[PDB]
Amino acid sequence: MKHTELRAAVLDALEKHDTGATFFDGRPAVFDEADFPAVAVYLTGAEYTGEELDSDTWQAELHIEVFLPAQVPDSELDAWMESRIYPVMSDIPALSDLITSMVASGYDYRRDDDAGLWSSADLTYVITYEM
């Protein structure tokens, strides 16, 4: 619905700064050891919390995952989502017009254990949007 344009707007607002990372839209990914540390944006959930007898007022969940190689220390990830992600999206008017209300949900770490080919930091947001 608006997921395509919401993702486009958020990736554009992410790309305004200096480059140095791939900006994989959506989800299929397929990285290989040449397009490394990168960022992927996608959505989940999207249920029918009504909350008002005026419109559907749906709500979904935003995932932005940044991938760095293998056993790179978590200081690099900390720097990444303190400099490249968290402040840059804090005020984007395009998303403000596209969605109703924005609120942070969580931010965690995961990694490959067997063969350790990757290490991801996930930032998870909650979107209330009128679709």
Closest CA to 127 of 27, 42, 52: 42
Distance CA 71, CA 101 (A): 36
Sole binder of another protein in the list 13, 86, 120, 128 (CB under 8 A)? 120
Sorted by sequence, the CB contacts under 8 Å of residue 107 that are 6+ apart come out as 81, 121, 122, 123, 124
Candidates 14-22, 31-39, 43-51, 91-99: pick the segment binding a copy of itself (CB under 8 A): 43-51
Which pair of tokens denotes residue 130? 């009128």
Shortest distance (Å) from residue 108 CB to a copy of itself: 7
Shortest distance (Å) from residue 3 CB to a copy of itself: 4
Sole binder of a copy of itself in the list 11, 42, 88, 118 (CB under 8 A)? 42
Sole binder of another protein in the list 79, 87, 100, 109 (CB under 8 A)? 109
Which pair of tokens denotes residue 51? 């909350």
How many C-beta atoms surround the C-beta of residue 42 within 10 A? Answer: 17
Site residues for another protein per CB under 8 A:
11, 15, 22-33, 40, 42, 65, 67, 69-73, 75-76, 109-118, 120
